[PDB]
Short mmCIF file of C-alpha atoms in Angstrom, two decimals:
data_model
loop_
_atom_site.label_atom_id
_atom_site.label_comp_id
_atom_site.label_asym_id
_atom_site.label_seq_id
_atom_site.Cartn_x
_atom_site.Cartn_y
_atom_site.Cartn_z
CA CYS Y 1 117.46 65.71 114.40
CA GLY Y 2 116.25 68.72 112.37
CA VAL Y 3 115.52 66.68 109.16
CA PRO Y 4 111.68 65.96 108.87
CA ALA Y 5 110.37 62.95 107.07
CA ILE Y 6 107.66 65.10 105.48
CA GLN Y 7 109.37 68.28 104.07
CA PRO Y 8 107.69 71.60 104.75
CA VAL Y 9 106.40 73.60 101.85
CA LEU Y 10 107.00 77.23 102.34
CA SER Y 11 105.37 79.71 99.82
CA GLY Y 12 105.49 83.42 99.44
CA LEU Y 13 102.41 83.62 101.64
CA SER Y 14 104.45 82.62 104.64
CA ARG Y 15 106.20 86.08 104.54
CA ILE Y 16 103.07 88.24 104.82
CA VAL Y 17 100.29 89.23 107.23
CA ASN Y 18 99.51 86.06 109.30
CA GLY Y 19 101.61 83.58 107.45
CA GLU Y 20 100.01 80.44 106.04
CA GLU Y 21 98.87 76.87 106.72
CA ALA Y 22 101.53 74.21 107.19
CA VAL Y 23 101.66 70.87 105.43
CA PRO Y 24 100.36 68.33 107.87
CA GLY Y 25 103.14 66.52 109.73
CA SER Y 26 105.90 68.78 108.40
CA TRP Y 27 107.04 70.15 111.77
CA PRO Y 28 107.32 66.95 113.72
CA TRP Y 29 108.91 68.45 116.95
CA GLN Y 30 105.92 70.61 117.23
CA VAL Y 31 104.05 69.80 120.38
CA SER Y 32 100.81 71.05 122.21
CA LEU Y 33 100.56 71.41 126.04
CA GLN Y 34 97.05 70.67 127.32
CA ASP Y 35 95.64 70.92 130.72
CA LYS Y 36 93.01 68.67 132.32
CA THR Y 37 90.24 70.79 131.10
CA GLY Y 38 91.80 69.58 127.83
CA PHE Y 39 92.68 73.26 126.96
CA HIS Y 40 95.69 73.97 124.69
CA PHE Y 41 97.54 76.58 126.57
CA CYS Y 42 101.04 76.55 125.22
CA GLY Y 43 103.48 75.09 122.48
CA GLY Y 44 107.01 73.26 122.72
CA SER Y 45 109.61 71.21 120.93
CA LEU Y 46 110.69 67.73 121.29
CA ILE Y 47 114.48 67.45 121.48
CA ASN Y 48 114.36 63.70 121.93
CA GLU Y 49 111.87 60.99 122.90
CA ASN Y 50 112.03 61.78 126.65
CA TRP Y 51 112.45 65.61 126.55
CA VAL Y 52 110.52 68.70 125.71
CA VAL Y 53 111.52 72.38 125.74
CA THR Y 54 109.07 75.12 126.60
CA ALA Y 55 108.94 78.56 128.14
CA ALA Y 56 109.07 79.05 131.86
CA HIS Y 57 106.17 81.58 131.85
CA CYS Y 58 103.96 78.61 130.64
CA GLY Y 59 103.65 77.41 134.28
CA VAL Y 60 103.59 73.69 133.41
CA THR Y 61 102.84 71.11 136.17
CA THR Y 62 102.94 67.34 136.29
CA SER Y 63 99.23 67.40 135.81
CA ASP Y 64 99.58 68.70 132.34
CA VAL Y 65 100.04 66.62 129.22
CA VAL Y 66 102.21 66.89 126.08
CA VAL Y 67 100.39 66.23 122.76
CA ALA Y 68 102.54 65.08 119.71
CA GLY Y 69 101.58 64.59 116.01
CA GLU Y 70 98.50 67.05 115.87
CA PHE Y 71 97.82 69.24 112.76
CA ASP Y 72 94.12 70.22 113.51
CA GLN Y 73 92.92 70.56 117.11
CA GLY Y 74 89.37 70.18 115.80
CA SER Y 75 90.20 66.78 114.31
CA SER Y 76 89.36 63.19 115.60
CA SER Y 77 91.09 61.02 112.97
CA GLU Y 78 94.51 62.18 113.75
CA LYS Y 79 96.64 59.50 115.32
CA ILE Y 80 98.27 61.65 117.97
CA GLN Y 81 100.34 60.82 121.04
CA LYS Y 82 99.41 61.96 124.69
CA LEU Y 83 102.26 62.04 126.91
CA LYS Y 84 102.51 62.32 130.71
CA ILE Y 85 105.21 64.49 132.31
CA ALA Y 86 107.34 63.01 135.00
CA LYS Y 87 109.33 66.01 136.03
CA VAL Y 88 109.40 69.91 135.26
CA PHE Y 89 112.64 71.82 135.40
CA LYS Y 90 112.31 75.55 135.47
CA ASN Y 91 115.42 77.60 134.91
CA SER Y 92 116.45 79.02 138.29
CA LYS Y 93 117.34 82.45 136.84
CA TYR Y 94 113.76 82.89 135.59
CA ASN Y 95 112.47 86.30 136.46
CA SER Y 96 108.79 86.44 135.96
CA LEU Y 97 108.99 90.19 136.24
CA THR Y 98 111.39 90.71 133.33
CA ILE Y 99 110.46 87.48 131.49
CA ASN Y 100 114.15 86.80 131.15
CA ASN Y 101 115.75 83.29 131.03
CA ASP Y 102 112.35 82.08 129.89
CA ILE Y 103 112.91 78.36 129.64
CA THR Y 104 111.58 75.09 131.17
CA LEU Y 105 112.48 71.36 130.38
CA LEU Y 106 110.03 68.65 130.65
CA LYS Y 107 111.04 65.06 131.18
CA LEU Y 108 108.25 62.73 130.09
CA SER Y 109 107.00 59.94 132.11
CA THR Y 110 106.45 58.01 128.80
CA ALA Y 111 108.73 58.16 125.83
CA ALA Y 112 107.47 59.49 122.59
CA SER Y 113 107.35 56.99 119.76
CA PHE Y 114 109.11 58.77 116.84
CA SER Y 115 107.67 58.12 113.36
CA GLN Y 116 107.24 60.04 110.21
CA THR Y 117 105.17 62.73 111.96
CA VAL Y 118 106.97 62.95 115.36
CA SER Y 119 110.71 63.58 115.74
CA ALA Y 120 113.26 65.99 117.31
CA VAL Y 121 114.60 69.50 116.41
CA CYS Y 122 118.40 70.22 116.85
CA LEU Y 123 119.86 72.33 119.70
CA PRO Y 124 122.42 75.00 118.75
CA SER Y 125 125.91 75.48 120.31
CA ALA Y 126 126.59 78.29 122.80
CA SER Y 127 128.92 79.57 120.14
CA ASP Y 128 126.58 79.52 117.13
CA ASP Y 129 126.03 82.87 115.44
CA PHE Y 130 122.67 83.49 113.66
CA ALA Y 131 123.15 86.78 112.05
CA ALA Y 132 120.64 89.57 111.85
CA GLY Y 133 118.59 89.32 108.59
CA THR Y 134 118.62 85.50 108.54
CA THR Y 135 115.20 84.15 107.67
CA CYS Y 136 113.78 81.72 110.18
CA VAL Y 137 110.36 80.11 110.76
CA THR Y 138 107.82 80.07 113.63
CA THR Y 139 105.01 77.64 113.73
CA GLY Y 140 101.95 77.10 116.07
CA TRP Y 141 98.23 77.35 116.92
CA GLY Y 142 98.81 80.98 118.21
CA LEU Y 143 96.29 82.69 115.98
CA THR Y 144 93.34 81.19 117.49
CA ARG Y 145 90.97 80.98 120.43
CA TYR Y 146 91.37 84.89 119.91
CA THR Y 147 88.56 87.52 119.11
CA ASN Y 148 85.48 87.78 116.99
CA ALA Y 149 85.51 84.02 116.36
CA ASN Y 150 86.99 80.62 116.95
CA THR Y 151 87.06 78.66 113.69
CA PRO Y 152 89.18 75.42 112.77
CA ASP Y 153 92.48 75.18 114.45
CA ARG Y 154 95.16 74.01 112.05
CA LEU Y 155 98.91 74.49 112.37
CA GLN Y 156 100.13 77.79 110.77
CA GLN Y 157 103.75 78.80 109.74
CA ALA Y 158 105.54 82.05 109.12
CA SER Y 159 109.00 83.11 107.51
CA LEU Y 160 110.53 85.92 109.47
CA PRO Y 161 113.91 87.68 109.74
CA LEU Y 162 116.14 87.82 112.84
CA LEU Y 163 116.87 91.29 114.26
CA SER Y 164 119.87 92.53 116.27
CA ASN Y 165 119.06 93.50 119.92
CA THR Y 166 120.07 97.04 119.11
CA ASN Y 167 117.32 97.30 116.46
CA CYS Y 168 114.82 95.48 118.62
CA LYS Y 169 115.38 97.97 121.32
CA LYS Y 170 113.79 100.57 119.03
CA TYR Y 171 110.52 98.87 119.56
CA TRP Y 172 110.63 97.31 122.97
CA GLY Y 173 113.27 99.63 124.83
CA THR Y 174 114.82 98.30 128.04
CA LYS Y 175 112.74 95.29 128.10
CA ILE Y 176 115.23 93.58 125.78
CA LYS Y 177 118.11 91.72 127.64
CA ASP Y 178 120.99 89.58 126.22
CA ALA Y 179 119.25 86.22 126.92
CA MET Y 180 116.44 87.32 124.34
CA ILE Y 181 116.33 87.58 120.49
CA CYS Y 182 113.71 89.34 118.35
CA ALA Y 183 112.28 88.38 115.00
CA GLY Y 184 109.80 89.98 112.57
CA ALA Y 185 108.52 93.58 112.03
CA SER Y 186 108.70 92.47 108.41
CA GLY Y 187 105.09 92.77 107.25
CA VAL Y 188 104.11 89.52 109.06
CA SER Y 189 102.85 88.98 112.71
CA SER Y 190 104.44 86.59 114.90
CA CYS Y 191 101.36 85.65 116.80
CA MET Y 192 100.90 82.29 115.20
CA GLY Y 193 103.59 80.86 117.54
CA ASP Y 194 102.23 79.68 120.79
CA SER Y 195 103.82 80.84 124.03
CA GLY Y 196 106.84 78.34 124.52
CA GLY Y 197 106.65 77.42 120.82
CA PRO Y 198 109.49 77.25 118.26
CA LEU Y 199 111.61 79.72 116.36
CA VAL Y 200 113.67 77.54 114.04
CA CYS Y 201 116.63 78.24 111.68
CA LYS Y 202 118.31 75.99 109.27
CA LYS Y 203 122.12 75.36 110.08
CA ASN Y 204 123.98 72.70 107.97
CA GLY Y 205 120.81 71.58 106.25
CA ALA Y 206 119.17 70.83 109.76
CA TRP Y 207 116.44 72.85 111.44
CA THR Y 208 117.71 74.24 114.63
CA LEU Y 209 116.05 75.73 117.74
CA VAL Y 210 117.09 79.42 117.89
CA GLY Y 211 114.12 80.77 119.91
CA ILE Y 212 111.27 80.00 122.20
CA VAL Y 213 108.11 82.31 122.15
CA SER Y 214 108.25 84.62 125.11
CA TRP Y 215 106.04 87.54 124.11
CA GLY Y 216 104.72 89.73 121.18
CA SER Y 217 102.76 92.80 120.05
CA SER Y 218 99.55 93.42 122.07
CA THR Y 219 97.63 93.64 118.86
CA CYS Y 220 99.59 91.21 116.85
CA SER Y 221 100.89 93.89 114.53
CA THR Y 222 102.89 93.11 111.39
CA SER Y 223 105.20 95.93 112.25
CA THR Y 224 106.32 94.93 115.73
CA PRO Y 225 108.75 92.09 116.33
CA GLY Y 226 108.10 89.07 118.48
CA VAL Y 227 110.56 88.48 121.56
CA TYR Y 228 111.90 84.93 122.01
CA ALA Y 229 114.12 83.23 124.52
CA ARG Y 230 117.62 82.98 123.04
CA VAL Y 231 118.38 79.24 123.29
CA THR Y 232 122.02 79.89 122.42
CA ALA Y 233 122.27 81.74 125.80
CA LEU Y 234 120.46 79.03 127.70
CA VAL Y 235 121.90 75.91 126.29
CA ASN Y 236 124.77 75.30 128.81
CA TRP Y 237 121.85 75.08 131.44
CA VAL Y 238 119.95 72.63 129.19
CA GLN Y 239 123.05 70.56 128.95
CA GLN Y 240 123.70 70.55 132.69
CA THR Y 241 120.09 69.60 133.50
CA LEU Y 242 120.08 66.71 130.91
CA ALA Y 243 123.46 65.41 132.18
CA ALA Y 244 122.32 65.38 135.67
CA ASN Y 245 118.73 64.02 135.26
CA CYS W 1 98.93 74.37 100.73
CA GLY W 2 99.00 72.15 97.47
CA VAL W 3 98.35 68.96 99.50
CA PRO W 4 94.69 67.66 99.42
CA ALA W 5 93.33 65.50 102.24
CA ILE W 6 91.55 63.61 99.61
CA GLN W 7 94.00 62.30 97.05
CA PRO W 8 93.05 62.85 93.26
CA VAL W 9 92.76 59.70 91.06
CA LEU W 10 93.86 60.35 87.42
CA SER W 11 93.57 57.57 84.84
CA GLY W 12 94.10 57.40 81.10
CA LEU W 13 90.70 58.80 80.33
CA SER W 14 91.96 62.03 81.70
CA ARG W 15 94.12 61.95 78.56
CA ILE W 16 91.52 61.81 75.82
CA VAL W 17 88.44 63.38 74.40
CA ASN W 18 87.14 65.73 77.19
CA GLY W 19 88.72 64.15 80.29
CA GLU W 20 87.07 62.35 83.25
CA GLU W 21 85.10 62.99 86.43
CA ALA W 22 87.20 63.83 89.48
CA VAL W 23 86.90 62.06 92.77
CA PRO W 24 84.71 64.28 94.98
CA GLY W 25 86.67 66.58 97.34
CA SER W 26 89.90 65.90 95.57
CA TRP W 27 90.53 69.36 94.12
CA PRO W 28 89.73 71.35 97.37
CA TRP W 29 90.75 74.81 96.15
CA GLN W 30 88.25 74.85 93.23
CA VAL W 31 85.42 77.38 93.62
CA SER W 32 82.43 78.48 91.63
CA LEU W 33 81.50 81.98 91.01
CA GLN W 34 77.77 82.66 90.87
CA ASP W 35 75.66 85.75 90.59
CA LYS W 36 72.95 87.19 93.00
CA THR W 37 70.31 84.84 91.22
CA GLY W 38 72.64 81.71 91.13
CA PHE W 39 73.97 81.53 87.47
CA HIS W 40 77.39 79.85 87.54
CA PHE W 41 79.59 82.13 85.36
CA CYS W 42 83.21 81.60 86.23
CA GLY W 43 85.57 79.51 88.28
CA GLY W 44 88.28 80.46 90.78
CA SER W 45 91.06 79.10 93.27
CA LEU W 46 91.30 79.58 97.05
CA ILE W 47 94.81 80.67 97.99
CA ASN W 48 93.81 81.00 101.60
CA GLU W 49 90.75 81.45 103.71
CA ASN W 50 90.25 85.06 102.76
CA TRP W 51 91.25 85.28 99.17
CA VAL W 52 90.26 83.89 95.68
CA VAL W 53 92.14 84.21 92.38
CA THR W 54 90.21 84.34 89.19
CA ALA W 55 90.33 85.89 85.65
CA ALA W 56 90.01 89.65 85.16
CA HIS W 57 87.75 89.03 82.03
CA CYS W 58 85.29 87.40 84.41
CA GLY W 59 83.95 90.91 85.40
CA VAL W 60 83.27 89.93 88.99
CA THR W 61 81.42 92.33 91.30
CA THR W 62 80.72 92.43 94.94
CA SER W 63 77.17 91.21 94.24
CA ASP W 64 78.51 87.80 93.04
CA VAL W 65 78.90 84.81 95.52
CA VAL W 66 81.72 82.28 95.85
CA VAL W 67 80.82 78.67 96.29
CA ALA W 68 83.34 76.22 97.91
CA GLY W 69 83.32 72.45 98.48
CA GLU W 70 81.14 71.66 95.42
CA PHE W 71 81.21 68.65 93.31
CA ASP W 72 77.91 68.08 91.58
CA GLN W 73 76.04 71.15 90.86
CA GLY W 74 72.79 69.23 90.56
CA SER W 75 73.04 68.10 94.12
CA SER W 76 71.31 69.96 97.14
CA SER W 77 72.75 67.48 99.47
CA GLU W 78 76.25 68.75 99.54
CA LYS W 79 77.80 70.58 102.40
CA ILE W 80 79.08 73.56 100.50
CA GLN W 81 80.10 77.12 101.73
CA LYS W 82 78.54 80.13 100.05
CA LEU W 83 80.88 83.00 100.61
CA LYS W 84 80.33 86.78 100.18
CA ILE W 85 82.75 89.09 98.65
CA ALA W 86 84.21 92.25 100.36
CA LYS W 87 86.36 93.94 97.58
CA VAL W 88 87.39 93.08 94.10
CA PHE W 89 90.90 93.92 92.82
CA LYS W 90 91.55 93.68 89.09
CA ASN W 91 95.23 93.96 87.85
CA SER W 92 95.51 97.32 86.40
CA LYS W 93 97.84 96.25 83.59
CA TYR W 94 94.82 94.25 82.31
CA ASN W 95 94.43 94.83 78.69
CA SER W 96 90.95 94.33 77.66
CA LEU W 97 92.04 94.40 74.06
CA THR W 98 94.59 91.70 74.03
CA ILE W 99 93.30 89.88 77.14
CA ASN W 100 96.85 90.06 78.58
CA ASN W 101 97.45 90.14 82.37
CA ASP W 102 94.10 88.42 82.97
CA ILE W 103 93.81 88.22 86.72
CA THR W 104 91.66 89.33 89.65
CA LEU W 105 91.69 88.97 93.31
CA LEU W 106 88.66 88.75 95.36
CA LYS W 107 88.78 89.45 99.22
CA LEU W 108 85.99 87.53 101.01
CA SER W 109 83.61 89.30 103.47
CA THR W 110 83.25 85.94 105.03
CA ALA W 111 86.25 83.72 105.54
CA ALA W 112 86.29 80.03 104.20
CA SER W 113 86.40 77.23 106.69
CA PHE W 114 89.13 74.97 105.85
CA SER W 115 88.24 71.19 105.90
CA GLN W 116 88.81 67.85 104.27
CA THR W 117 87.18 69.22 101.08
CA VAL W 118 88.03 72.92 101.29
CA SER W 119 91.71 74.12 101.28
CA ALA W 120 94.26 76.12 99.36
CA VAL W 121 96.40 75.73 96.18
CA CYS W 122 100.11 76.81 96.33
CA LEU W 123 101.35 79.80 94.31
CA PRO W 124 104.71 79.63 92.42
CA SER W 125 107.79 81.96 92.96
CA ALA W 126 108.27 84.55 90.18
CA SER W 127 111.50 82.58 89.30
CA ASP W 128 109.77 79.24 88.93
CA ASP W 129 110.40 77.66 85.75
CA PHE W 130 107.87 75.14 84.54
CA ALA W 131 109.26 73.35 81.35
CA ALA W 132 107.29 72.53 78.18
CA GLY W 133 106.02 68.99 78.03
CA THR W 134 105.36 68.91 81.76
CA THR W 135 101.91 67.28 82.38
CA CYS W 136 99.45 69.52 84.43
CA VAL W 137 95.84 69.34 85.41
CA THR W 138 92.89 71.62 84.59
CA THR W 139 89.60 71.09 86.22
CA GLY W 140 86.18 72.63 86.11
CA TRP W 141 82.36 72.56 85.03
CA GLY W 142 83.05 74.18 81.65
CA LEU W 143 81.17 71.41 79.85
CA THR W 144 77.94 72.93 81.27
CA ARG W 145 78.50 76.01 79.00
CA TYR W 146 77.10 73.77 76.20
CA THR W 147 73.45 74.70 76.90
CA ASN W 148 71.85 72.38 74.42
CA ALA W 149 74.04 69.37 75.45
CA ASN W 150 72.88 70.55 78.87
CA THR W 151 75.73 68.24 80.04
CA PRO W 152 77.12 66.29 83.06
CA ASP W 153 77.31 68.63 85.96
CA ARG W 154 80.15 67.04 87.99
CA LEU W 155 83.67 68.36 88.31
CA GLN W 156 85.85 67.07 85.32
CA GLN W 157 89.63 66.86 85.16
CA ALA W 158 92.04 66.58 82.27
CA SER W 159 95.80 66.09 82.01
CA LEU W 160 97.45 68.41 79.52
CA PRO W 161 101.18 69.06 78.61
CA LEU W 162 102.56 72.62 78.86
CA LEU W 163 103.76 74.24 75.58
CA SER W 164 106.42 76.79 74.88
CA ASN W 165 104.96 80.10 73.62
CA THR W 166 107.03 79.70 70.35
CA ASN W 167 105.14 76.50 69.77
CA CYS W 168 101.80 78.08 70.75
CA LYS W 169 102.15 80.81 68.11
CA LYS W 170 101.70 78.12 65.45
CA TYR W 171 98.20 77.88 66.50
CA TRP W 172 97.02 81.39 67.68
CA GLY W 173 99.78 83.67 66.18
CA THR W 174 100.57 87.12 67.52
CA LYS W 175 97.77 86.78 70.00
CA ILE W 176 100.31 84.98 72.30
CA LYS W 177 101.82 87.49 74.80
CA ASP W 178 104.59 86.81 77.26
CA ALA W 179 102.17 86.83 80.25
CA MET W 180 100.33 83.99 78.78
CA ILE W 181 100.89 80.19 78.89
CA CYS W 182 99.38 77.39 76.62
CA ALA W 183 98.65 73.89 77.36
CA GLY W 184 97.09 70.90 75.69
CA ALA W 185 96.40 70.03 72.03
CA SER W 186 97.50 66.46 72.54
CA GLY W 187 94.30 64.66 72.14
CA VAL W 188 92.34 65.97 74.94
CA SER W 189 90.22 69.08 75.06
CA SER W 190 90.69 72.10 77.58
CA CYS W 191 87.04 73.26 77.47
CA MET W 192 86.38 71.64 80.89
CA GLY W 193 88.09 74.64 82.54
CA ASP W 194 85.66 77.38 83.38
CA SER W 195 86.92 81.01 82.87
CA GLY W 196 89.09 81.94 85.66
CA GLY W 197 89.59 78.29 86.84
CA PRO W 198 93.01 76.49 87.64
CA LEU W 199 95.75 74.97 85.72
CA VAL W 200 97.84 73.21 88.35
CA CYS W 201 101.23 71.41 88.24
CA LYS W 202 103.10 69.64 90.95
CA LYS W 203 106.18 71.19 92.28
CA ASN W 204 108.07 69.39 95.12
CA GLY W 205 104.90 67.24 95.55
CA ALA W 206 102.62 70.08 95.96
CA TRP W 207 100.01 71.22 93.58
CA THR W 208 100.85 74.77 92.34
CA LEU W 209 98.78 77.24 90.34
CA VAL W 210 100.65 77.76 87.15
CA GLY W 211 97.73 78.98 84.78
CA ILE W 212 94.35 80.84 85.02
CA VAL W 213 91.81 79.83 82.20
CA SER W 214 91.84 82.90 79.94
CA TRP W 215 90.71 81.96 76.43
CA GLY W 216 90.82 79.65 73.34
CA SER W 217 88.53 77.62 71.25
CA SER W 218 84.77 78.22 71.37
CA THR W 219 84.11 74.41 71.06
CA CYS W 220 85.98 71.57 72.76
CA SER W 221 88.99 71.05 70.64
CA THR W 222 91.61 68.15 71.09
CA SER W 223 94.07 69.62 68.75
CA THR W 224 94.16 73.25 69.78
CA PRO W 225 95.92 74.52 72.97
CA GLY W 226 94.01 76.47 75.60
CA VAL W 227 95.32 79.72 76.64
CA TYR W 228 95.97 80.80 80.27
CA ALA W 229 97.20 83.68 82.39
CA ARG W 230 100.91 82.94 83.45
CA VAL W 231 100.75 83.09 87.27
CA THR W 232 104.57 83.32 87.64
CA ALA W 233 104.36 86.66 85.70
CA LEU W 234 101.62 88.01 87.94
CA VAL W 235 102.73 86.62 91.27
CA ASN W 236 104.42 89.78 92.41
CA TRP W 237 101.28 91.94 92.17
CA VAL W 238 99.35 89.18 94.12
CA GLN W 239 101.76 89.31 97.13
CA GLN W 240 101.69 93.00 96.98
CA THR W 241 97.91 93.29 97.02
CA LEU W 242 97.53 90.69 99.80
CA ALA W 243 100.27 92.47 101.96
CA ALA W 244 98.34 95.59 101.85
CA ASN W 245 94.61 94.81 101.95
#
């Protein structure tokens, strides 16, 4: 896991305003969730050929589909993979009021066929410490279907610092609980990440899942952090679900 | 960035005389600067959907238009984008007497629509080192400046080695300032670059803007280097302007 076939190119543009375009295929765990209207409504991460992680607040059913190996939603060439979902596991301590514990697992009804452009991310340990001030990446198709346009829909990337939960409370107050982590307020928005999409950090040379898009600034400001689901807090649940199903 | 959908073909003819025609689409960041009335006066590069980099001595105003996705200027059958300019940001350390610090940013009033033939060049870090003798690529319509040759109006390319500035002063003397870079004099011209246009090298398999066509020979010369603006010396100001505007 965590070691793409096509390496990402990150430039200095990835640190500022709305980030930058990714290199096609360079984030191969990146998935789209589509409904039956064909509408992209959330992101997610393959953690193997059978299993996808997403946010609970994404509300996935077994009538949704997982899309792998997209770059441009507006494209027709792209050899993508459209996968059916066998079973949706929502974390039982999910509070839709507080958006805490914001994680769902999806077991696919058909296995993903891993290639150069489709592969897994790595899951952290419950013990892993990702310090404040560590620069980590978020990707997705977040920035559009938005306002005063539409325009082509190509996978964007941004480089953003981890905060402490003490420093994050200065923007969100009591909304922040221990099963969350914040990133950003750095001069770049986090709104490229889709809800349920990745926040990844590189740990022993491997890109690893540290966060899952939960919510952000109501106006996508480059001065207010995004709020993620703290995977390292959720991972004993993920491990139990996997061992049992 | 730096990774074209339509892969450039560079043969030996890019290495002599005045270079060769490019494959259409294959240098997707390349733009043309025109005035109100449609005179092509300068070149530029897209760095994203909102921003173009060009030369300060180009004297761009918000009347001028930016044309993207062009190959043959003589064709009305090309699906090109003509883009309007919002503001123009010259570098204030631009010395109109030595032509040093020769760079301008244009912010577009109307965003570029990225496609198979329109997309962005990468920018270097301020610490990037690009060695002498590294072979890099300059493209443009500069041959059309030769009014009574009238000339081929298709995009050209040439492959030309970088020089050290020590070695460049054997040609141009004390005109050569630290915020400059020279390339060529090995048997192929540099005159195909339009003023403002790109000099690109590949870093980690991505095409990266190392130079901006600043000055040199008034005629196409195979044995004199061309002189460019050194993007790595300028790249801090760029990030800074973008971050704020």
